[PDB]
Amino acid sequence: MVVKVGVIGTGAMGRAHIDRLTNVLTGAEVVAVTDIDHEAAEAAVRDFHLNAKVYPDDTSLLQDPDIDAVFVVSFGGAHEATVLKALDTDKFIFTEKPLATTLEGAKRIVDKELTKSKKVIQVGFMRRYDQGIRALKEKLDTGIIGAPLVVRASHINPNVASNYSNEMAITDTLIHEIDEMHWLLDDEYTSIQITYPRQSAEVRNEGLHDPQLATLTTKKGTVIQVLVHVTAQYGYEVKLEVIGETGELQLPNYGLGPILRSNANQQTAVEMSWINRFIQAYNTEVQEFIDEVAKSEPPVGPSAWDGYIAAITAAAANRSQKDQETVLINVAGTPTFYQ
Amino acid sequence: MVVKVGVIGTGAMGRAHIDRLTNVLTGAEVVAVTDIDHEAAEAAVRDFHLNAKVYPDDTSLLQDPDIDAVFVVSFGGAHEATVLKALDTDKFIFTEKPLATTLEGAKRIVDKELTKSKKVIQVGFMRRYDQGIRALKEKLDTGIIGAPLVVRASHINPNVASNYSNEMAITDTLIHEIDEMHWLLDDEYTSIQITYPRQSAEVRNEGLHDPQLATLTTKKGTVIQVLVHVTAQYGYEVKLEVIGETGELQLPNYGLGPILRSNANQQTAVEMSWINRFIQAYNTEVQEFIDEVAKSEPPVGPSAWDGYIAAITAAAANRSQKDQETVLINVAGTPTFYQ
Amino acid sequence: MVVKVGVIGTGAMGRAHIDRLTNVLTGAEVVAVTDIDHEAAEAAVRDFHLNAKVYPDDTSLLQDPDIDAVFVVSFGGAHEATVLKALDTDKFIFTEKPLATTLEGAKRIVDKELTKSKKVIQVGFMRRYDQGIRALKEKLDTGIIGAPLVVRASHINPNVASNYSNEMAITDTLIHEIDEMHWLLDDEYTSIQITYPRQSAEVRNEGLHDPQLATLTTKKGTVIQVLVHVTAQYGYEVKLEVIGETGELQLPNYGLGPILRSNANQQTAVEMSWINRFIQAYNTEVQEFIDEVAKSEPPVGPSAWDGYIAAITAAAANRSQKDQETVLINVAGTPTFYQ
Amino acid sequence: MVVKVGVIGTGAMGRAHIDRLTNVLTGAEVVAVTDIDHEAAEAAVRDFHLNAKVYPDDTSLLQDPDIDAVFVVSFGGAHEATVLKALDTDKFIFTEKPLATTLEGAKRIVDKELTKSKKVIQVGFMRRYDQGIRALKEKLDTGIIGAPLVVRASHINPNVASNYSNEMAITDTLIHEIDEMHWLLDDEYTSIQITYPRQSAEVRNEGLHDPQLATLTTKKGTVIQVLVHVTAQYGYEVKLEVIGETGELQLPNYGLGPILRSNANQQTAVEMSWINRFIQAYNTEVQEFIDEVAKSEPPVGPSAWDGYIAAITAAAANRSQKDQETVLINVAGTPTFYQ
Numbered sequence A, B, C, D: 001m002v003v004k005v006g007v008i009g010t011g012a013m014g015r016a017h018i019d020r021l022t023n024v025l026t027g028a029e030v031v032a033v034t035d036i037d038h039e040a041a042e043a044a045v046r047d048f049h050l051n052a053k054v055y056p057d058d059t060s061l062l063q064d065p066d067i068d069a070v071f072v073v074s075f076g077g078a079h080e081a082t083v084l085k086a087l088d089t090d091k092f093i094f095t096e097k098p099l100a101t102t103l104e105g106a107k108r109i110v111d112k113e114l115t116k117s118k119k120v121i122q123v124g125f126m127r128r129y130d131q132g133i134r135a136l137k138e139k140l141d142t143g144i145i146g147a148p149l150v151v152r153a154s155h156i157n158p159n160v161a162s163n164y165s166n167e168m169a170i171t172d173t174l175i176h177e178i179d180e181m182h183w184l185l186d187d188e189y190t191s192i193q194i195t196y197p198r199q200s201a202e203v204r205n206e207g208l209h210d211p212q213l214a215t216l217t218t219k220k221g222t223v224i225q226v227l228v229h230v231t232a233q234y235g236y237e238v239k240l241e242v243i244g245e246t247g248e249l250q251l252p253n254y255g256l257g258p259i260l261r262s263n264a265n266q267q268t269a270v271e272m273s274w275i276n277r278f279i280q281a282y283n284t285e286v287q288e289f290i291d292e293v294a295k296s297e298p299p300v301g302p303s304a305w306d307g308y309i310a311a312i313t314a315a316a317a318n319r320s321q322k323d324q325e326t327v328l329i330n331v332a333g334t335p336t337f338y339q
């Protein structure tokens, strides 16, 4: 039997999740939608040929007793309240990142979900589902390179829109690494420091520093060095290297396109779209959520606790962006509810 | 509508197709299976959690009116009779390659299908659906390397089962390249020659020559040199290089796993089976079949005609296997039914 | 103590050898030169600031008692006579390839050398000294991939000059693979066959077929497939893959230049010059010869007998070029003098 | 003419330089040696078949008027006094790194050299002669990736001797990157900071932190992140990546050895010896020195001023090692003498 889904927020990513649920993946149907732009909601039903109700708001959607799960894909600042409303129902909840735009909001969601008899929230950190990143983590966990001492990573994007701010370097971009590293390493963060190399001439946006260097430390002492470079021009690329006691692991060459020998060069195309880079991870992530719902079991993907960790770390990083000083992080031990 | 599927042959690939139809793809349910090994059939039903009938043979399964489409996934030599029996029904038919193991068998199938009012057979030539191979073809077709003069290909398997015969080097293995190159180049064959290099000590099957070299020539004069090496030990690999007038195109190494630096080496894993190497291609081809069946429309993928055309060249190769002499090929034009 | 060298032929490669001997390598001095173009010879003296005598011909140069070794770097057709004269002296002899332009010439040399008390000839087949090619042979010889069954190789050149003939595809280009493969495999050839794929539109030379496919068979059964492509446009490239019973070996990409990420591509440069490609090999080869002469020991590089094997094989290939048919090769057993 | 050389310090590197000068490179002869271990010097003479005088100390050796140049290859701490003595002579001076073990000693040398009628000192920072590193610099200097924003580098070593100390992570290992980067970027340093990640279990030496992270900043604002890992086990490796405004450049994998397909992996060998890694650079660096001396021209390699920059920066690094705090660097303008 089919997992009946409501979607709250039918913009870009909302529509892409609808497409996933409707066209790409198995076992679900979108039967309700809402958007504060009623017209956007109506277009979704129309464009994807859904047999679905358009609700005027989130509150009314959430009272529909036939909806098994909700996807929250509205503006980030709007997640917190909506998630708290859905927690007054029994529905499963897939929220895109962030769990909340403040760490205070995140803690509320955590505290409330912790009052429930079982976990219902999955947060949209898709990196964990990417085949390559997953395969590296698995290899690391065999012990073949010993303990992880240093991690070096890059988050490379070709160009940004007019609306991209200095803070979004953290909240939209580094956030992926923020969720990824503690999971990768099975460790907790103790600090974050953002430093600014010389400013790129390619930056067109007021207040945006690019590139940015993020250094994180963990409780076991692993140091993580992330390069964030969002006006890099050449392509979209995610790089990851783990330095171990006895060896190293890194992500392979990405891409399926051919190797061209021509005009005194050998070359391969580089991905230009993060959308395309992570198509697989999005599919895998959402299919897993649906599969869990379908058997009336809690999600096994990133949780509200993960969302809270990310929120705390992002806020520490936003603080660090002001003065380039190291900010400490102390995250509480995970409630057993979240293991 | 959800397509109700029967699967005939529930070995390695039968199982993989059941898995994908059940857990990954959309719009299908496996409702019946059969295998000459009843235990294998029962194992498939249980391992994939099916509510499926287990029929004692193909003929009984084919006479179940509730089945919309059948998958023929038995030993290659068994496809011919099963496909012919299925053509006595109104079911859609997906057969794995080869269409048959002889030219005469393939021709029987085409002759019978031509008596029907619409086309119902798709053949599992999945290479055409592989994203990398498609990307190479599309780049070739831009003209960037000029005309294709030579193609070099490898079809590498680590080992074979005890039932793998010399003839199967062509009908089970080379058949992929036989179909592929004529699609890739939009050209047809004028000859094939099989030669036998130094026999590997790794061969364990009586009568099997390994490796084998296949030289195919096309009408436009492109020469294709295929290496078939099915006891290679190291891994499963498909390699493709197109030599043009002004450049070259090559398929990249396939791999998701990490690069490991350890013990005086830098290494990456190689796939050990088709099952994972071509998972995308199998998913795509099968989804397309199911989507067509759902509309009660003929398949748009490779046809029994493509199967026959390949069988002509395969039969030529099997003839060449006897004396290592070149065998001429001149295939008939595509009948209107198959255009 | 310094090996005194005379150079016979002071053209492009003659000058390059002079340069090596004078400015790059250790233990030698060019004290005499000759060229049928006297002006070229004088120029070589001035240009390399030599303390050397210019002789009118090879005969007179060869009478200088102070010369320990001669370099034969004239037109290929001139090698035979000069090498035969030099064998009337006790001097060591480095001849560039070919040993002789006919097989009968090569045999005359071998027969004459066999009367001497020690071996004095090294032939300039430099591939054997290329570090990459050597490293591959070495790894092969460890047994790690088992016995070599098939060799796939490419000799890629961007364009040719107007003097380049069909037969030069063998005598100037394939000759390197002809010397290389029997050495690589510790084997003897039994046949060669040249075939012509579709003719490239890039060919501008009368009578030239390009590309050419060369297939060689060996006594142990290994099949060698070489692609010769001399109007390839994109670069100069030497490729080598050995298919073994239990694994494969291939040369890596040549070049030390950086990997560039730019403009939606990842790229490395491709060499356009065979000269640049084989700088190291030429240096290593000549240094070895000099080092042997310095000890008054026989050269240990490719011998007149290797020159003979090359000549017989090349002749067979030029024969095959007429009709694309296989031509047998039965090389006599190696004389103990050459073992 | 032949450059007559004296060598001070005939240990591992001094013997390696003697070997270069005698058996590999052109244009030099070792005619004098000294070592505080007299038996080591005598042994160098025997082992390399030198026609050389053994002197009991540096002072005595420096009085041989037949010596055109001296090589200083003693303990680092002995370089300063010896170089200063040598500057009272007219001989040219090749000193292995470091110029001096204190910045004050380096200044003394600089100050003294500045009084002379020509520059005579070259310092053994061989990285600048490495073909791959040079090719990367050259490409960077074309402007193709825009301005350099960040540099990421690794200095990876398998294991260290029992006498390797924490400070040697800087003075023996990071010193190479210290000289390299300011040259690479044509910039000057403004700061250095050494941080200590998780301590490796592979460390056997009391007080040694491994790995170590070094962050250098430059006047133009480029940030350099170096990973120093000297108990890495797997191999010896130098990595370099330059992140530009519009692209990236990175050094390719080192090695000419083959790609092996075997045992479910594709692999290439990793160098285990620093010696073999930089053999080319050592040869080139020394040949260039000898070629300059042959002409009575000043060296064009790394100078005493480069030695001073390195000593200042190393000193700052050793200071940073105490508390992991950033240390400023402000080197004086380069004297015209050293331009």
Ligand SMILES: NC(=O)c1ccc[n+]([C@@H]2O[C@H](COP(=O)([O-])OP(=O)(O)OC[C@H]3O[C@@H](n4cnc5c(N)ncnc54)[C@H](O)[C@@H]3O)[C@@H](O)[C@H]2O)c1
Pocket (backbone or CB within 6 Å): A008, A009, A010, A011, A012, A013, A014, A034, A035, A036, A037, A040, A058, A073, A074, A075, A076, A078, A096, A097, A098, A124, A125, A126
């Ligand atoms: N990689 C990822 O995981 C990833 C990628 C893209 C976007 N996202 C996240 O998805 C969310 C949406 O991003 P987007 O790119 O689609 O933005 P968007 O602006 O296109 O779409 C958001 C939609 O939400 C609607 N909306 C806003 N507030 C609402 C409310 N309270 N209730 C209902 N609807 C509301 C808007 O009208 C709009 O239609 C954001 O949280 C974004 O961070 C995540």
Ligand SMILES: NC(=O)c1ccc[n+]([C@@H]2O[C@H](COP(=O)([O-])OP(=O)(O)OC[C@H]3O[C@@H](n4cnc5c(N)ncnc54)[C@H](O)[C@@H]3O)[C@@H](O)[C@H]2O)c1
Pocket (backbone or CB within 6 Å): B008, B009, B010, B011, B012, B013, B014, B034, B035, B036, B037, B040, B058, B073, B074, B075, B076, B078, B096, B097, B098, B124, B125, B126, B172, B274, B278
């Ligand atoms: N397209 C591809 O890449 C790909 C990959 C693997 C296999 N195949 C094809 O799939 C088919 C099956 O191969 P496999 O690897 O699964 O082999 P397998 O040996 O694992 O399984 C074959 C199954 O067929 C059963 N069988 C044999 N004859 C039968 C008959 N008359 N009726 C019913 N069942 C019968 C056997 O008992 C066995 O269970 C072959 O045609 C093979 O060429 C294609």
Ligand SMILES: NC(=O)c1ccc[n+]([C@@H]2O[C@H](COP(=O)([O-])OP(=O)(O)OC[C@H]3O[C@@H](n4cnc5c(N)ncnc54)[C@H](O)[C@@H]3O)[C@@H](O)[C@H]2O)c1
Pocket (backbone or CB within 6 Å): C008, C009, C010, C011, C012, C013, C014, C034, C035, C036, C037, C040, C058, C073, C074, C075, C076, C078, C096, C097, C098, C124, C125, C126
């Ligand atoms: N091993 C290699 O890779 C390689 C590379 C280049 C050339 N070669 C060989 O080197 C030889 C010379 O080639 P090149 O490119 O220098 O050609 P070139 O034409 O530049 O020079 C040849 C020189 O030989 C002189 N010469 C001709 N006949 C002579 C004779 N009887 N005595 C003395 N001098 C004579 C010519 O006047 C000319 O100066 C050829 O055999 C060529 O095949 C080998």
Ligand SMILES: NC(=O)c1ccc[n+]([C@@H]2O[C@H](COP(=O)([O-])OP(=O)(O)OC[C@H]3O[C@@H](n4cnc5c(N)ncnc54)[C@H](O)[C@@H]3O)[C@@H](O)[C@H]2O)c1
Pocket (backbone or CB within 6 Å): D008, D009, D010, D011, D012, D013, D014, D034, D035, D036, D037, D040, D058, D073, D074, D075, D076, D078, D096, D097, D098, D124, D125, D126
């Ligand atoms: N550039 C490079 O990459 C590189 C590599 C290795 C060594 N080096 C440098 O080479 C120098 C030597 O290192 P090594 O590995 O050969 O060490 P080593 O200990 O093997 O040899 C040093 C030699 O110097 C002798 N010696 C010590 N003090 C002396 C003095 N006052 N006068 C004369 N001789 C003296 C010692 O007896 C010994 O024989 C060091 O400065 C080292 O840092 C540079």
Ligand SMILES: O[C@H]1[C@H](O)[C@@H](O)[C@H](O)[C@@H](O)[C@H]1O
Pocket (backbone or CB within 6 Å): B157, B172, B173, B176, B230, B274
């Ligand atoms: O049946 C399989 C299948 O066709 C594979 O794709 C091929 O690689 C194997 O050689 C063959 O035995």
